[PDB]
From a paper:
Careful analysis of the obtained CESH[L] structures revealed a potential active catalytic triad consisting of D18, H190, and E212, along with the active water molecule in RhCESH[L] while the corresponding possible catalytic triad in KlCESH[L] consists of D48, H221, and E243.
All these three CESH[L]s exhibit high sequence identity (>60%) with L-2-haloacid dehalogenases, which are members of the haloacid dehalogenase (HAD)-like superfamily. Studies have shown that both RhCESH[L] and KlCESH[L] adopt a two-step catalytic reaction mechanism by 18O-labeling studies.
Residue numbers in the entry:
A (entry chain B): 11 to 247
B (entry chain A): 11 to 246
The structure:
């Protein structure tokens, strides 16, 4: 039934939280303790989601890198007592979102899926970010699709359907793979299949995760490889 | 100086002629001689090029698959005394353009380049076509860019510049890689580096060769691996 798997990347395929924590700490060093920087990372993603939530409501697209940067600048103002960052460091910190490392299952998972499916990124991240993430996260796609291509973020239907259009397939032939229910629900609305990837450490060792029940989505897996097995993709050697 | 190599794919990386000849012969079987099908394949590409020139002149974008299909249909009418195709075979024949096999240097050449460069396809083919060709030609990209993304075909500046902007890199940090002078000349006009890949068999043995001397483009190579070597990429 499915011709292509479209993947959310951040969190779903990538441990963005570990990346952004280690990245900030590498850049800022002694200037912020791990505990405070983790807090910042969490608020940063939170500001990002709030801005994207806003932009989706406004049916507007803007550079997600600019979203991360503006959110970071707003957050550095909030924490200006604790530490500061130069504009150069703001850019280097914001680069962290394009340095996401993948979960260990993901490369072999993606490779396994490719025997039977096209695999494409469908990310709200700017096109250049997902391309960069491809390198840090060792993601090799048939296609990289970004909100930037459609002028709209997920969950807007034009992303999934524009992905379907670009891939020359029906939305019903897309299996959306995400570790965020909103993404799957929105893909479902255009008729795509839904594959939920549990990422219990996505928000850290004490992070609160969606408790997706079986039967909510077409697939519910702990790894891309397990998804690949359930789609009948031959195992890798 | 280059952060990304942007590749034309058809001809540059793929032996489309051999692909389309073998593909058509597979589909049509006894119905067509190799010599006739070769001629049609060459005329088909020419109809595509003519129609693409029209659309480019005409500042419109159209599905390139539809361009191939429509031109094939027109060619089948011209060749109707010799053989026929059903509509299903028209689709299957048209699919050959999405089944391009690469020249043998290309996959390892692309792999050698990735150590230092982002490698992206920038094709006039539809997005789904180049994705499909990624499978048939074993092309693994950092990014797949199509004229379809830009509503304009190469050589239009919005393709190279859209590619640059999408990749988040200056055009001058793009090395455009193509086996067609027009593509490199247009990429040059937006500031991209130029690498001409000679493909002497691109149009088969009797094909006419572009007058591309050394120094006309930044690089002049016979393989993607050779380009990789000249760009300082270690062998894998």
């Amino acid at each position: 039934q499915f011709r292509a798997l479209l993947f959310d990347v951040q969190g779903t395929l990538t441990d963005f939280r570990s990346t952004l924590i280690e990245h900030g700490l590498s850049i800022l060093g002694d200037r912020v303790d791990r505990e405070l920087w983790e807090e910042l990372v969490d608020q940063w993603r939170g500001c990002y989601r709030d801005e994207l939530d806003s932009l989706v409501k406004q049916e507007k697209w803007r550079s997600v890198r600019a979203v991360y940067r503006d959110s970071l600048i707003n957050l550095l103002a909030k924490f200006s007592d604790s530490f500061c960052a130069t504009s150069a460091e703001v850019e280097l910190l914001t680069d962290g979102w394009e340095r996401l490392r993948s979960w260990p299952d993901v490369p072999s998972g993606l490779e396994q899926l490719r025997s039977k499916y096209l695999v494409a990124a469908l990310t709200n991240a700017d096109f250049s970010a997902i391309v960069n993430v491809g390198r840090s996260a060792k993601l090799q796609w048939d296609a990289v699709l970004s909100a930037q291509l459609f002028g709209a973020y997920k969950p807007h239907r034009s992303t999934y359907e524009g992905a379907a259009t670009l891939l020359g397939i029906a939305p019903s032939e897309i299996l959306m793979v995400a570790s965020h229910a909103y993404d799957l629900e929105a893909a479902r609305e255009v008729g795509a299949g839904t594959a939920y990837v549990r990422r219990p450490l996505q928000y850290g060792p004490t992070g609160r995760t969606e408790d997706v029940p079986d039967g909510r989505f077409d697939f519910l897996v702990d790894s891309i490889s397990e998804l690949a097995d359930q789609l009948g993709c031959p195992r890798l050697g």
